[PDB]
C-alpha cells in the first residue's frame, strides 16, 4: 500500500485538483457512477480554459503597463476574442466596463 | 472559525505562473475566476449528466465529456479543449 | 451531377410565403439572398449538434429525437416530436 | 522501415527499424537518438499499448506510419 501517494494531477501532468472533481461529481448528483477518466478529462479542459483567458488577460494588463490583472483586463480579454465572446455572451463581469466603440455616423465630420 | 471554504484560488496562481511568470491577480479577479471555473464545470457536468440518460447509460465516462465539450465550446476552442483532454487522459492511463 | 448548388431549392416564392406568415407587405429583391444565408447558418448550427449526438450514440441514422435534443440545447424547443 | 514517432508536443522522430523487429531495439533506437530511459517512455499505437518483445509486423505496420511516444513521469 504505502507509500508516496502520487497525486493524480501529477499523474496526468495537470495543475487542477483531479481529486476534487470526483468529490464535485459524485456529490453533484449527475449519475450513479463516474468513470475514472472523467475527472481527468474535466481537469484538462478547465485548465485549458483558465490558461487561455489568463494568457490574454496578461497581454491586456501589459498594454496598460500594469502587473496585476484587474477585472477590467479580464473583460477586455473576453470581449476581444470572438470565440470566447460566443462562450460568454450572457455573462456580465463586475467592474469590468465596456469595450470602447463608436459608430462612424456619430463621429464628427469636418468635410 | 473551523468552517473551511474551498475554492480554486491556489490553482489559478499556479497556472498563471506558467503562462505569465511575472504578473499577479487581484482578489476581485480571483473571485471572478472562482465563479468562471464553477460555471463551466456545472455547464459541462449538466451536459454529461443528460448525455448519460440520453443514451440510457448510468456512468459518466470521458467519452461523453469529450462529446459534451464539443457541444458547448464553440469553434476551434472545442478542438483545442479535446486536444488537452485526450493529452491529459492518455498520460494518466499510462501511469 | 455531384453536389449541386441546391440552396436555390429554397425558392423565391417560398421565402415570400414565410414572410407573409409574419405579416410582410413588400419584399425588396435583396431579401432572398440574405434569407438563404441566415437559413444555412441555422441549419449548420442545428445539424452540427444533431450529428454530434448521433456520433455519441454510435449510430448512423439521425433520429428525430436527436434533432429535438439539438434544438433544445439552443433554447428553441419543439413540441410533438419528443417521444 | 521509414516510420516517424510523434510526441505529445509535436516533435517528429523517424526510426529505422524494419517491420519484423521487436520493441527492444525500437526503444534502444529511441535512447541512442534522444537519451530517455525505458522507465521514462512508453509507446502507443492506435490507442493500444505495445509489448516490448512483440514484433512490429503483427500490428500490420505500413510505410510512413505514425507512432506516439508518451513520456512516463515517475517521481
Amino acid at each position: 500500500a504505502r507509500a508516496k501517494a502520487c497525486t493524480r494531477s501529477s499523474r496526468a501532468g495537470l495543475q487542477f485538483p483531479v481529486g476534487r472533481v470526483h468529490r464535485l461529481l459524485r456529490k453533484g448528483h449527475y449519475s450513479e457512477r463516474v468513470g475514472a477518466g472523467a475527472p481527468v478529462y474535466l481537469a484538462a479542459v478547465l485548465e485549458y480554459l483558465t490558461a487561455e483567458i489568463l494568457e490574454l488577460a496578461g497581454n491586456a494588463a501589459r498594454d496598460n503597463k500594469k502587473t496585476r490583472i484587474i477585472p477590467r483586463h479580464l473583460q477586455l480579454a473576453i470581449r476581444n476574442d470572438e470565440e470566447l465572446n460566443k462562450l460568454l455572451g450572457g455573462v456580465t463581469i463586475a467592474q469590468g466596463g465596456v469595450l470602447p466603440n463608436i459608430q462612424a455616423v456619430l463621429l464628427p465630420k469636418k468635410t | 472559525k473551523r468552517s473551511r471554504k474551498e475554492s480554486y484560488s491556489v490553482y489559478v496562481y499556479k497556472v498563471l505562473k506558467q503562462v505569465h511568470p511575472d504578473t499577479g491577480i487581484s482578489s476581485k479577479a480571483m473571485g471572478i475566476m472562482n465563479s468562471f471555473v464553477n460555471d463551466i464545470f456545472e455547464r459541462i457536468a449538466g451536459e454529461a449528466s443528460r448525455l448519460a440518460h440520453y443514451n440510457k447509460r448510468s456512468t459518466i465516462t470521458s467519452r461523453e465529456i469529450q462529446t459534451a465539450v464539443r457541444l458547448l465550446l464553440p469553434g476551434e476552442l472545442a478542438k483545442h479543449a479535446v486536444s488537452e483532454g485526450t493529452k491529459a487522459v492518455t498520460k494518466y492511463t499510462s501511469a | 451531377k455531384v453536389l449541386r448548388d441546391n440552396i436555390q431549392g429554397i425558392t423565391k416564392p417560398a421565402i415570400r410565403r414565410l414572410a407573409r406568415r409574419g405579416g410582410v407587405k413588400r419584399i425588396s429583391g435583396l431579401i432572398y439572398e440574405e434569407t438563404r444565408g441566415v437559413l444555412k447558418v441555422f441549419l449548420e448550427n442545428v445539424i452540427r449538434d444533431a450529428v454530434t449526438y448521433t456520433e455519441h450514440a454510435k449510430r448512423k441514422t439521425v433520429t428525430a429525437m436527436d434533432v429535438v435534443y439539438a434544438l433544445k440545447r439552443q433554447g428553441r424547443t419543439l413540441y410533438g416530436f419528443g417521444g | 522501415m521509414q516510420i516517424f514517432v510523434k510526441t505529445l508536443t509535436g516533435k517528429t522522430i523517424t526510426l529505422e527499424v524494419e517491420p519484423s523487429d521487436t520493441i527492444e531495439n525500437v526503444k534502444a533506437k529511441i535512447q541512442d537518438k534522444e537519451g530517455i530511459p525505458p522507465d521514462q517512455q512508453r509507446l502507443i499505437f492506435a490507442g493500444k499499448q505495445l509489448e516490448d518483445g512483440r514484433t512490429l509486423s503483427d500490428y500490420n505496420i505500413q510505410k510512413e506510419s505514425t507512432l506516439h511516444l508518451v513520456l512516463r513521469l515517475r517521481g
Partner: peptide
C-alpha cells in the same frame, strides 16, 4: 474522429488568432 476518445487528432501549434 468523433469516436473512442482519441490518439490522432491532438493538435497543431498554439491558436494565436490575434
Amino acid at each position: 474522429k468523433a469516436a473512442d476518445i482519441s490518439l490522432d487528432n491532438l493538435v497543431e501549434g498554439k491558436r494565436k488568432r490575434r
